[PDB]
Design a protein around this ligand. Structure first.
Ligand SMILES: Nc1nc2c(ncn2[C@@H]2O[C@H](COP(=O)(O)OP(=O)(O)OP(=O)(O)O)[C@@H](O)[C@H]2O)c(=O)[nH]1
Ligand SMILES: [Mg+2]
Lengths: 177, 180, 18, 415
């Protein structure tokens, strides 16, 4: 069971890696403690297929507070994925970075957040605005040090009405606390 | 059973092989991997995690798994030791103070009973400054000849130039593949 | 045919209001 | 400001959960079921629960409760709107809303949940727009989400340009037991299935009373819609300026406007029912249905529900037009009529037995509700005047619309 799943996930075949990822996702939804296999799924994270990357990101987000020590092996992957040409991949990486409740991980995520704050893609801009609010809620001092308030304020006075609304909501949430 | 399909696949090339990228930080490992894969000196931030890439040469897929030399990532090299067939050690001849640390890390990584079939692959990185040693002084200092049951080979590769990478790849292919 | 009343074509605008 | 949107089941098991802020522990869902059970057994059950410092506000679905936990003073209306949008998205993607698709569409369900809301703030809710970036069978997100027009995907091309409208009427009557009608309101529903090429800007024009008064023609038959709720595509500023209904129709079927005005006319169907229920001996149902609607309109599929006794057995129906059947599951007599011409009068004489032993507890008097549906009959008298379909390329549209009159909350209080 667990050994077979680990062997399938540690293979060189994408057809077996996708099946292992799907089984791990189903086990977590079915109510199975799959946090023990978090380090094994870390190796099979940087994949070209977008179908398995989303599952890996969801597993990391749901298995981040449980194993914060094992989550240190994903900062480089997040940094690499934060510069992908596809807006969807960048938005997913930004959402996953802010969704991880790791004290030692949000500190190194300030640079990707700053880079994606001025992203031309409206989806990327909205993802960065959401991640800034998430980081401020997680760590207000880190957000203040990163100077994201000035970037958030300029978001309302720019184009992309959806992105402007998202930035306004993030600013209201930050000011609420 | 029948092995006709295997013979047909091997008639045009079937073996791929593997490789590892370990060493101290700022040792040219990322630059060496970029040169092997692309062929340009790409400047990158320090490897907080790891980099995984593949190189296609001589009909063998030489997959390279770059590993950083950070203190928090030094003990993480055991994660890639599972299902690993090759290992490449990147030395830092431009760091006299870090040479001892790199040698100690190589000895610690080579003192595991799980990593026994991985032949030694010493790459002389940063081979562009006059302070860099030769291909024998570094090996003598590291004691590569004292590694019993270890097939190590010291090769000097210049990160800026790229010379010696072909020789290292050929040596790795000869050590991995034992056919015509 | 169709239950609930047959569909009828609609105009383009108030032609009597200019 | 939802903290974690989760989907429950009928047995208390969480089919799927997706935390958005992480400020609420995932173990609080276990106490939601006991809290709901306690609230239901004491009459204090509400859609919004409260587990200490965390509130569990969710609605009841077909088979699972979409409970969304929250901790701060989050907007309850916003949470309800997000839940409704999620339910609509699930219905559009999955034809059935039950446990059969929750455990079978997890791969796409998780992606849809992640893309719909981030950090508790929803960003994308259009099913048509969301279907171009998240599919169960990924390219860059469409420019429609980033662009202002998020309800009409650009580049749509069709062989023909046909738009089908549906002016569905809802005749709701609240008739008290004294014979008078208390709540008699008619809510319009203009649902159109736009199927055109490009991104046309529809200019809806009707015989509104306000528009007729402004233009100076406030003397003909004009619909006096007390409340008009336009869709997202309809420009609020244009309607507020000079009653100009200009909007880009979406690709598919959607609700453009939803009129709602009171009705001061006589009911289309008048039910005169009597209850000659003997004391544990028998019961009589002298129910007579009078059609006050126009004779040119026929109320197809007329079903006047007459609530009979719950313990009544061996019932006999003596009617004139239409089949009368008693369903023990509903505990009422369904006066089903296939065709009900306007001005017709159907008389029925029910007769059912009753056990000698009296019931232990009272059962109440449910109101009698009719299911009349007369097509091609507009009670409010509102008629579509024009539909300005304008396209940059230039094409000849073929708009269509049909008027359907049905019964909404048309219940009659019993004696
Ligand atoms: N100019 C120059 N620098 C070199 C050369 N060889 C190695 N370096 C240094 O080595 C570093 C190589 O770092 P990377 O290519 O990003 O990857 P790395 O070797 O694993 O270093 P880390 O990422 O810190 O672990 C560069 O920053 C250079 O400063 C060389 O031939 N010329
Ligand atoms: Mg590197």
């Amino acid at each position: 069971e667990i050994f077979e799943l680990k062997a399938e996930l540690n293979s060189d075949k994408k057809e077996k890696k996708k099946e292992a990822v799907k089984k791990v996702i189903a086990s977590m939804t079915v109510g199975k403690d799959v946090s023990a296999l978090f380090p094994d799924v870390v190796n099979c994270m940087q994949t070209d297929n977008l179908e398995l990357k989303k599952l890996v990101y969801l597993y990391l987000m749901n298995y981040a507070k449980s194993q914060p020590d094992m989550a240190i092996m994903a900062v480089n992957t997040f940094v690499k994925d934060c510069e992908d040409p596809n807006p969807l991949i960048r938005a997913l990486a930004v959402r996953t970075m802010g969704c991880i409740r790791v004290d030692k991980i949000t500190e190194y995520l300030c640079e990707p957040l700053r880079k994606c704050l001025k992203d031309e893609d409206p989806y990327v801009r909205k993802t960065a605005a959401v991640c800034v609010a998430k980081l401020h809620d997680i760590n207000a001092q880190l957000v203040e040090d990163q100077g994201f308030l000035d970037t958030l304020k300029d978001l309302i006075s720019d184009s992309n009405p959806m992105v402007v609304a998202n930035a306004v909501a993030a600013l209201s949430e930050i000011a609420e606390s | 059973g029948n092995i006709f399909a295997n013979l047909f696949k091997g008639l045009f090339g079937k073996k791929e092989m593997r490789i590892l990228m370990v060493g101290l930080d700022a040792a040219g490992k990322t630059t060496i991997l970029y040169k092997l894969k692309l062929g340009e000196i790409v400047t990158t931030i320090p490897t907080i995690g790891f980099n995984v890439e593949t190189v296609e040469y001589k009909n063998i897929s030489f997959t390279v798994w770059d590993v950083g030399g950070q203190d928090k990532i030094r003990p993480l090299w055991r994660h890639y030791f599972q299902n690993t067939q090759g290992l490449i050690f990147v030395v830092d001849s431009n760091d006299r103070e870090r040479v001892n640390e790199a040698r100690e890390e190589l000895m610690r990584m080579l003192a595991e009973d799980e990593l026994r079939d991985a032949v030694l692959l010493v790459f002389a990185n940063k081979q562009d400054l006059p302070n860099a040693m030769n291909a024998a002084e570094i090996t003598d200092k590291l004691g590569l000849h004292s590694l019993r049951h270890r097939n190590w080979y010291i090769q000097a590769t210049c990160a800026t130039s790229g010379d010696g990478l072909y020789e290292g790849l050929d040596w790795l292919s000869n050590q991995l593949r034992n056919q015509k | 045919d169709r239950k609930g009343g047959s569909y009828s074509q609609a105009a383009g605008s108030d032609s009597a209001q200019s | 400001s939802a903290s974690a949107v989760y989907v429950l089941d009928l047995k208390g098991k969480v089919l799927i959960c997706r935390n958005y802020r992480g400020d609420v522990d995932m173990s609080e869902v276990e106490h939601f079921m006991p809290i709901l059970m306690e609230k239901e057994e004491e009459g204090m059950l509400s859609p919004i629960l409260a587990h200490g410092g965390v509130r569990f506000m969710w609605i009841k679905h077909n088979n699972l409760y979409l409970v969304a936990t929250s901790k701060k003073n989050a907007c309850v209306s916003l949470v309800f709107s997000f839940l409704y949008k999620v339910v609509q998205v699930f219905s559009e993607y999955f034809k059935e809303l039950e446990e059969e698709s929750i455990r079978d569409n997890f791969v796409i369900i998780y992606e849809l949940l992640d893309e719909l809301m981030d950090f508790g703030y929803p960003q994308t809710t259009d099913s048509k727009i969301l279907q171009e970036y998240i599919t169960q069978e990924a390219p860059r997100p469409p420019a429609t989400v980033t662009n202002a027009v998020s309800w009409r995907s650009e580049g749509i091309k069709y062989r023909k340009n046909e738009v089908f409208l549906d002016v569905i009427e809802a005749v709701n009557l609240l008739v008290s037991a004294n014979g008078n009608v208390l709540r008699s309101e008619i809510v319009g529903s203009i649902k159109m299935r736009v199927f055109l090429s490009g991104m046309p800007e529809l200019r809806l024009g009707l015989n509104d009373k306000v528009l007729f008064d402004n233009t100076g023609r406030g003397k003909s038959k004009s619909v006096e819609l007390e409340d008009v709720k336009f869709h997202q595509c309809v420009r609020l500023s244009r309607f507020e300026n000079d009653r100009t209904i200009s909007f880009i129709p979406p690709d598919g079927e959607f609700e453009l406007m939803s009129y709602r005005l009171n009705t001061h006319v006589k009911p289309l169907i008048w039910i005169e029912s009597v209850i000659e229920k003997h004391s544990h001996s028998r019961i009589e149902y002298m129910v007579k249905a009078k059609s006050q609607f126009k004779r040119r309109s026929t109320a197809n599929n007329v079903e006047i529900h007459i609530p009979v006794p719950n313990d009544a057995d061996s019932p006999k129906f003596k009617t004139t037009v239409g089949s009368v059947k008693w369903v023990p599951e509903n505990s009422e007599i369904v006066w089903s009529v296939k065709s009900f011409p306007g001005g017709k009068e159907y008389l029925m004489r029910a007769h059912f037995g009753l056990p000698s032993v009296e019931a232990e507890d009272k059962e109440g008097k449910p109101p009698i509700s009719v299911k009349f549906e007369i097509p091609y009959f507009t009670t409010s008298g509102i008629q579509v005047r024009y539909l300005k379909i304008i396209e940059k390329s230039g094409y000849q549209a073929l708009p269509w619309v049909r008027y359907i009159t049905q019964n909404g909350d048309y219940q009659l209080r019993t004696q």
